[PDB]
Design a protein around this nucleic acid. Sequence first.
DNA 1: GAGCGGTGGTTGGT
DNA 2: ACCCACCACCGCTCA
Length: 406
Amino acid sequence: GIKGIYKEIGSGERISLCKLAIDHLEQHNRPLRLAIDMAIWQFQIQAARGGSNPAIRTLFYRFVRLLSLGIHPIFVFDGPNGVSTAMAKRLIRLFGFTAHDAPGEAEAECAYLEQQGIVDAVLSEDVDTIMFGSRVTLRDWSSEGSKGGPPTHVTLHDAKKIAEGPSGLDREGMVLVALMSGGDYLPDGIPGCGIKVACQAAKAGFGKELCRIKRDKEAITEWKQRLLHELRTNESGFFRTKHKALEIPENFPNMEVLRYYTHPVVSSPATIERLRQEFPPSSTVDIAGLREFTRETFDWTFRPGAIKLIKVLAPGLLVQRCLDRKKEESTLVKGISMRREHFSTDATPELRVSFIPAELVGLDPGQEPEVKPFDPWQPDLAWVPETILKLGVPVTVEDWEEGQRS
DNA sequence: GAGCGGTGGTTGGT
DNA sequence: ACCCACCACCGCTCA
Ligand SMILES: [Mg+2]
């Protein structure tokens, strides 16, 4: 749930992660900070086949993509209140990313971190994050349109635009929507009441009123008999019809379920404060660590496996190295050859950069046993956001720019 | 989780 | 008695 929510709030803006990451880097002068709920992986990585551990392999490639986007991720795990959690946490550490355990539900924690300013957006499986206080919420990190290929885009929902759009649904309203019609995930919901009726009750204002009331029987019995009377007669015309068959359980509205949404179990103030000092971390990618991980987990063994790690990892490391920080510069970028504004990044300016993968990664395939091909000591080419390049290798970008103006 | 067509119930009107 | 539009719910499909 909430089932049919997108008919009411819109299915969302659809947008390149690159574009979000780079717009934010341009506006706020630092990389986008993203809370990712580790639940999004369950039905997404199971399609992967072949080789060893194809599910954690896809996680690996998504992490390399995050490096390329220059995004500081914090992956949030559910708390007590077939990819191992331990293996995921290890791979997260190796990549210099952050792992965080929610005390309860991860989506609630993700929204909380956003509210408290630890992250700028949440990436989650659905828009429940909005009932929990999220303002910018992303879902469905995946490829675009008829292209069954690389995952470049996400679906963005803005709690502010939704509240001021046709649905009227803000945090308060949705809350009512699922007390009244969330009879599968929650107790004492109204049988026969679905999204339409619940929604037009939210609009009438019943969700605002309910959220501003002590959890004070005298006033919660009042609200109920306004709502109940209004459903029966539609005197104010808040509905499209009368609803006399709609029978309301004695125990509705369950105030303990209201508690679960308005005051969800999240980290303590002390924990929020530790995250302010420690996130994002000052961590670099553990290269030797990842070499050992990929040997053990994917059987990327011996020289072929060393060369495979290098090819896959190097564009990522380049971007990451750029965002850290008469002047060398070349130790990252050998040259630039072209510029484009591609539909896949929603016209984010990119420069065609050259680099030496093995040099950049710092692994020598020769120290490992031998068993049109890819040579990691030849120059490789990658498109990299012009903005990132300007921060990281400014005089190379300048030199290319004059080259162009001639 | 989210989209889809069928279906069975409700409502308000023929 | 019955139609009709709307709706919530169900199982089924991609995950
Ligand atoms: Mg959810």
